[PDB]
Scaffold this motif. Structure first.
Motif, PDB file in Angstrom:
ATOM      1  N   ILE A 193     -35.687   4.008 -28.255  1.00 30.17           N
ATOM      2  CA  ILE A 193     -35.048   4.922 -27.623  1.00 30.17           C
ATOM      3  C   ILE A 193     -35.632   5.009 -26.290  1.00 30.17           C
ATOM      4  O   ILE A 193     -35.487   6.169 -25.909  1.00 30.17           O
ATOM      5  N   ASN A 194     -36.448   4.332 -25.845  1.00 31.43           N
ATOM      6  CA  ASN A 194     -36.784   4.322 -24.319  1.00 31.43           C
ATOM      7  C   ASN A 194     -35.822   4.865 -23.239  1.00 31.43           C
ATOM      8  O   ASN A 194     -35.976   5.793 -22.656  1.00 31.43           O
ATOM      9  N   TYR A 195     -34.607   4.126 -23.111  1.00 33.41           N
ATOM     10  CA  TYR A 195     -33.725   4.242 -22.271  1.00 33.41           C
ATOM     11  C   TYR A 195     -33.151   5.448 -22.445  1.00 33.41           C
ATOM     12  O   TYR A 195     -32.989   6.330 -21.293  1.00 33.41           O
ATOM     13  N   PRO A 196     -32.447   5.781 -23.474  1.00 36.53           N
ATOM     14  CA  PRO A 196     -31.876   7.003 -23.779  1.00 36.53           C
ATOM     15  C   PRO A 196     -32.700   8.499 -23.295  1.00 36.53           C
ATOM     16  O   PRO A 196     -32.185   9.308 -22.750  1.00 36.53           O
ATOM     17  N   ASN A 200     -32.045  10.527 -19.769  1.00 34.76           N
ATOM     18  CA  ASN A 200     -31.638  12.246 -19.913  1.00 34.76           C
ATOM     19  C   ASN A 200     -32.772  12.889 -19.032  1.00 34.76           C
ATOM     20  O   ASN A 200     -32.683  14.121 -18.831  1.00 34.76           O
ATOM     21  N   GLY A 201     -33.682  12.183 -18.248  1.00 37.71           N
ATOM     22  CA  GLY A 201     -34.544  12.845 -17.364  1.00 37.71           C
ATOM     23  C   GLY A 201     -36.122  12.534 -17.685  1.00 37.71           C
ATOM     24  O   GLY A 201     -36.848  13.230 -17.138  1.00 37.71           O
ATOM     25  N   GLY A 202     -36.279  12.016 -18.843  1.00 40.63           N
ATOM     26  CA  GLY A 202     -37.737  11.410 -19.254  1.00 40.63           C
ATOM     27  C   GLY A 202     -38.184  10.983 -18.093  1.00 40.63           C
ATOM     28  O   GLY A 202     -37.467  10.096 -17.481  1.00 40.63           O
ATOM     29  N   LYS A 203     -39.650  10.997 -17.915  1.00 42.88           N
ATOM     30  CA  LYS A 203     -40.380  10.289 -16.645  1.00 42.88           C
ATOM     31  C   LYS A 203     -41.291   9.232 -17.223  1.00 42.88           C
ATOM     32  O   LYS A 203     -42.202   8.892 -16.279  1.00 42.88           O
ATOM     33  N   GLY A 204     -41.351   8.918 -18.272  1.00 42.71           N
ATOM     34  CA  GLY A 204     -42.248   7.784 -18.856  1.00 42.71           C
ATOM     35  C   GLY A 204     -41.872   7.371 -20.057  1.00 42.71           C
ATOM     36  O   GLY A 204     -41.393   7.989 -20.983  1.00 42.71           O
ATOM     37  N   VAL A 205     -42.881   6.513 -20.457  1.00 38.67           N
ATOM     38  CA  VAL A 205     -42.992   5.936 -22.096  1.00 38.67           C
ATOM     39  C   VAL A 205     -44.359   5.730 -22.389  1.00 38.67           C
ATOM     40  O   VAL A 205     -45.299   5.356 -21.469  1.00 38.67           O
ATOM     41  N   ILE A 206     -44.850   5.953 -23.651  1.00 37.53           N
ATOM     42  CA  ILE A 206     -46.091   5.399 -24.075  1.00 37.53           C
ATOM     43  C   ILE A 206     -45.964   4.632 -25.128  1.00 37.53           C
ATOM     44  O   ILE A 206     -45.439   4.969 -26.241  1.00 37.53           O
ATOM     45  N   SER A 207     -46.067   3.151 -24.853  1.00 37.37           N
ATOM     46  CA  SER A 207     -45.248   2.382 -25.591  1.00 37.37           C
ATOM     47  C   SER A 207     -46.201   1.464 -26.785  1.00 37.37           C
ATOM     48  O   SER A 207     -47.377   1.282 -26.305  1.00 37.37           O
ATOM     49  N   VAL A 208     -45.471   1.217 -27.710  1.00 35.81           N
ATOM     50  CA  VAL A 208     -46.317   0.106 -28.611  1.00 35.81           C
ATOM     51  C   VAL A 208     -45.786  -1.205 -28.148  1.00 35.81           C
ATOM     52  O   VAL A 208     -46.606  -2.168 -28.011  1.00 35.81           O
ATOM     53  N   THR A 209     -44.498  -1.419 -27.868  1.00 39.68           N
ATOM     54  CA  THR A 209     -43.957  -2.771 -27.461  1.00 39.68           C
ATOM     55  C   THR A 209     -44.623  -3.355 -26.451  1.00 39.68           C
ATOM     56  O   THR A 209     -44.903  -4.933 -26.073  1.00 39.68           O
ATOM     57  N   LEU A 220     -38.349  -1.868 -17.360  1.00 37.69           N
ATOM     58  CA  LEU A 220     -37.301  -0.987 -18.074  1.00 37.69           C
ATOM     59  C   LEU A 220     -37.620   0.633 -17.580  1.00 37.69           C
ATOM     60  O   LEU A 220     -36.416   1.108 -17.093  1.00 37.69           O
ATOM     61  N   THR A 221     -38.698   1.002 -17.413  1.00 38.23           N
ATOM     62  CA  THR A 221     -39.201   2.153 -17.083  1.00 38.23           C
ATOM     63  C   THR A 221     -38.776   2.395 -15.746  1.00 38.23           C
ATOM     64  O   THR A 221     -38.445   3.431 -15.177  1.00 38.23           O
ATOM     65  N   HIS A 222     -39.178   1.533 -14.825  1.00 37.36           N
ATOM     66  CA  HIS A 222     -38.933   1.584 -13.610  1.00 37.36           C
ATOM     67  C   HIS A 222     -37.586   1.383 -13.013  1.00 37.36           C
ATOM     68  O   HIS A 222     -37.134   2.109 -11.935  1.00 37.36           O
ATOM     69  N   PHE A 223     -36.866   0.608 -13.822  1.00 39.65           N
ATOM     70  CA  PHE A 223     -35.467   0.580 -13.260  1.00 39.65           C
ATOM     71  C   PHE A 223     -34.885   1.953 -13.751  1.00 39.65           C
ATOM     72  O   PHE A 223     -34.019   2.590 -13.011  1.00 39.65           O
ATOM     73  N   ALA A 224     -35.143   2.642 -14.777  1.00 40.16           N
ATOM     74  CA  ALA A 224     -34.515   3.902 -15.123  1.00 40.16           C
ATOM     75  C   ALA A 224     -35.093   4.878 -14.240  1.00 40.16           C
ATOM     76  O   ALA A 224     -34.109   6.026 -13.707  1.00 40.16           O
ATOM     77  N   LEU A 225     -36.458   4.908 -13.700  1.00 42.33           N
ATOM     78  CA  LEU A 225     -36.898   5.950 -12.954  1.00 42.33           C
ATOM     79  C   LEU A 225     -36.136   5.889 -11.613  1.00 42.33           C
ATOM     80  O   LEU A 225     -36.081   6.864 -10.854  1.00 42.33           O
ATOM     81  N   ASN A 228     -31.323   2.905 -11.956  1.00 43.30           N
ATOM     82  CA  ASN A 228     -30.759   1.838 -12.060  1.00 43.30           C
ATOM     83  C   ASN A 228     -30.341   1.619 -13.700  1.00 43.30           C
ATOM     84  O   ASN A 228     -31.078   1.147 -14.244  1.00 43.30           O
ATOM     85  N   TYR A 229     -29.555   2.605 -14.196  1.00 45.69           N
ATOM     86  CA  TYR A 229     -29.487   2.788 -15.454  1.00 45.69           C
ATOM     87  C   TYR A 229     -28.984   1.243 -16.152  1.00 45.69           C
ATOM     88  O   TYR A 229     -29.194   1.281 -17.176  1.00 45.69           O
ATOM     89  N   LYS A 230     -28.041   0.725 -15.471  1.00 50.15           N
ATOM     90  CA  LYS A 230     -27.236  -0.528 -16.176  1.00 50.15           C
ATOM     91  C   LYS A 230     -28.574  -1.487 -16.466  1.00 50.15           C
ATOM     92  O   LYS A 230     -28.252  -2.003 -17.447  1.00 50.15           O
ATOM     93  N   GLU A 231     -29.582  -1.804 -15.590  1.00 53.65           N
ATOM     94  CA  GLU A 231     -30.583  -2.569 -15.789  1.00 53.65           C
ATOM     95  C   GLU A 231     -31.632  -2.142 -16.786  1.00 53.65           C
ATOM     96  O   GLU A 231     -32.195  -2.895 -17.623  1.00 53.65           O
ATOM     97  N   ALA A 232     -31.846  -0.796 -16.962  1.00 52.75           N
ATOM     98  CA  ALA A 232     -32.833  -0.243 -17.832  1.00 52.75           C
ATOM     99  C   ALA A 232     -32.148  -0.505 -19.106  1.00 52.75           C
ATOM    100  O   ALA A 232     -32.818  -0.672 -20.208  1.00 52.75           O
TER     101      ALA A 232
END
Ligand SMILES: [Mg+2]
Ligand SMILES: [Mg+2]
Lengths: 297, 296, 296, 296
Positions: A193-196, A200-209, A220-225, A228-232
């Motif tokens: 659920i990284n993108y959702p 909603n205004g989250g500013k990063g991920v601490i990812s396993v994948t 993904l993260t940089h698209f979203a920040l 560019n929601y469509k590509e994220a």
């Protein structure tokens, strides 16, 4: 006006070779992360098997992370939590002393403190150092939840506390958090659920994948920040299968298996009570992997 | 596929002296139309479908269809049951009363298997020629329509075009739209309207819109226009009321709010539903003070 | 197999000025011995094992071992960890300190698989030659030792003789004893002490017994003699206190209660544990008035 | 209070050619009577009450009443609804057809509040003058009758004499009987029949007894006679079949088992219920081989 550490971040696996921390492997994996657009690395978090490392191993992986990221933009957000406040304070000071840019501090596991106890716990940590502190809420592992109110109180009362890494499968809570305190850095600790969370205004991920696919998680993260929601969303949708398969068994058993299957680490070694996955889940991880393009070193 | 999407309202059913206040019902639907709503859902969960007679069922669908004539607003009629033979009858009856589509809740109480849910919805889908929206609310039904079952039904039956998710599970909404991006994911959970829309959801079936139709309409249409900043701003702004409307089981808070706002004349339910506690009454009233509630 | 069963107490660890009140600890154990308790559990969950140093772990095991010499009371030492290498060390350490057996909690936080739990406990059991009691409390650890894993460990390992269940799952306790009636199922949940004992459980590791050791001791021994009537009657009488002692996370209420009595001088915890809220404080104080609390 | 207790069976409803197999229904009931069952429950959850017409509802109550005349066996008719007006009607309906009492499931799906549940059941209890047993199964209804509400209804209404608990919550069964020891707690969960009876429960409403009425009868009677050793052993023996009968949603496995044993002629359900998977079919058949199944 808080100092923050955000963006695409990786909860680094800790490779073992003959029961020892493979220190050269550790450095090589970190460089690989840097080369694929990652903004920060998280040594000795949950994915790094912090529970089964000695304090010296703790220091060794923070130091390797700090060295390898020197002279680059990539920051080091060191795992430094414990369910004993006195130890968590020491680990925080210890992490700062080794050059970490900030600390990730998991909510006390097992002993289930109350909300009042969690407040004093994190307040003691925050007052011990002068580097950013990110809370870490993962109730499925700790047995406790840091309430929205407690997170917001800690954000407002303590200077170094700048946000929370949510791994709780509760998008309602992430709405709650950012609706009542939009200045905090909400960080996804749940790859699927990284993108959702970001949308909603989250500013990063601490990812396993991102251990396996750092380029895809970073993108993904940089698209979203960049809104560019469509590509994220498109990368998030593509990653769903692997994001889920990496938790067919308890993290980090699948991700370390995948890293070994891809040839990125030399031995599928864990420290007990963690161990090799089942042979059916071994095959499941190997099959889901083949559908993704895995960068080398 | 023929679809019914956008901002939709799960209509409350006002009672006066124990009967359906048909004039209030029509007036409330007109209020929805005039505040940008794209479709209304008569006799859903929020409409107290469980305690209405079949005859009341027809009366509320007909009033909805009649009130929406001459407008773009569609009628997505509640028409589900935990007995497949009855759910088929309600679907056919809803179509004969002029509904544009049906919302069909997953069977409650008797917990069918995924195979049973597939056959249940397939029988419904083949009974009519209007759009059919699945409705997953495991907290109420005791069962879950799996992602695989939803996708199979979407692909195998022409009328099934999506699902109204009320499961507090954004992971599932990624799962759904990642493997079947052609389906219409509809949020049945007001507090997470924006996260669902932001992931490719195409509408809401709202409780809050009974009270704040303009805000839910604007939220949904901003999101459909990919103005995500404006949709999130209304969603964050609605969070307090979105949650307080569930301080007791829906529709107890929303009807309480509607009565406090003067939008219905009597705070009446049909047992086993009843007035809220006096503390939850006060809580609803307090949360209400921060919002602009349109009149008639 | 060698076993440790009967009425047992998970000892609280009193603090005075941030240090372990050693005198208090010994006096509390004596009080337990004198009120019919069959074994004491130093530095379990109720003993705040997470916030004690390894030095303090040793000190309370040593005090427990010395205080029970020349008596029939056994010492079942808390000696678990979510790191197998450390859990083995603590087991060996408890042994060397004269413990009669060890209670070893399922690894918390890192969520091992059933295969991992098996190898974890097998390594512990092969490290010592004293009885090992498994400890399953998923609400605290985040993982469950399945019935299959418990039974395999009981059958494959010499020292593993049973499990302390704190899972609110009487179905599992039927499952356990139906397929392996030779194991010692121990209640780790005071409110349901009697139902577990009546189904073939052979002891309790109690929180309530810190405050009311005579009542828990009587309950357990009544039940072990199949005097179910008397065991159930004490269980029913204790329900109110059994529940109120978990209004906040154990051991916050029991330590509060011990302080409200005359049994510890300072209500001290180690963070992240802390004093209860004021309303829970009066709440524990009100319920206590209903029971007769033995002194020293 | 007038009560209906002891070993009771939630009767399956056999279907043949899509219709209720009325002669099979009677043969099965007699089978229950001849194997020591104390009461039968027509058209409960296990009887597929949700998919029967009201006339089939009447037909199965009447067959039960007629088949039990001249015997000790009582008929506790399923007669619940999530609409109080319908539940009141079904209660009066059952009484006029000669039922000895009614089992009335907590309202499903519309999730009434504790206040609503109180008024719901009070309206039912005041509608008739025959015993009313509450039925708490939150996994199916989406709601829960709290201990306080159960006790209030028991104390305030003459004909409400207990509750059939199917919630896997032995703590609640302690809570219930510790604070109100005069109520009749009935097990609605076969696997934990003995723990509920051993805590003062006075009967079971069983799924398993459809297949093994003699074994459930003996278990219950041994327990009522305080021969807990013999009751526990039968409970332990039945555990495997008790669990396998819920590999899929009840009554899918029990009807499969009844068909496999030759006790019913057709493995037929009404949608949304359907045949089990062939994996689970095989599993039910394997588990059965260990039990001695009575014929007619
Ligand atoms: Mg332990
Ligand atoms: Mg505990």
């Amino acid at each position: 006006d808080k100092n923050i550490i955000i963006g695409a971040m990786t909860a680094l696996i800790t490779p073992f070779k003959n029961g020892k921390v493979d220190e050269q492997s550790y450095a090589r994996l970190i460089k690989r992360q840097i080369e694929n657009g990652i903004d920060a690395v998280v040594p000795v978090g949950t994915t790094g098997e912090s529970a089964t490392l000695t304090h010296e191993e703790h220091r060794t992986c923070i130091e390797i992370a700090v060295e390898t990221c020197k002279g680059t933009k990539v920051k080091v957000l060191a795992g430094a939590g414990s369910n004993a406040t006195h130890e968590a304070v020491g680990l925080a000071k210890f992490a700062k002393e080794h050059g970490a840019d900030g600390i990730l501090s998991v909510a006390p596991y097992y002993n289930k403190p109350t909300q009042q106890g969690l407040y004093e716990h994190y307040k003691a940590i925050a007052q011990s150092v002068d580097i950013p502190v990110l809370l870490y809420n993962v109730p499925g592992r700790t047995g406790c939840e840091i309430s929205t109110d407690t997170i917001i109180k800690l954000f407002r009362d303590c200077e170094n506390i700048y946000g929370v890494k949510e791994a709780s499968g509760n998008i309602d809570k992430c709405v709650d958090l950012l609706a009542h305190e939009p200045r905090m850095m909400l960080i996804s600790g749940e790859d699927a659920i990284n993108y959702p969370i970001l949308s909603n205004g989250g500013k990063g991920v601490i990812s396993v994948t991102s251990n396996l696919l750092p380029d895809m998680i970073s993108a993904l993260t940089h698209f979203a920040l960049d809104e560019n929601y469509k590509e994220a969303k498109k990368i998030n949708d593509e990653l769903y299968n692997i994001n889920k398969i990496l938790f067919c068994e308890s993290n980090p058993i699948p991700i370390k298996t995948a890293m070994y299957l891809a040839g990125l680490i030399e031995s599928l070694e864990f420290r007990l009570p963690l161990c090799s996955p089942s042979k059916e889940n071994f095959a499941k991880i190997e099959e889901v992997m083949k559908k993704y393009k895995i960068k080398g070193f």
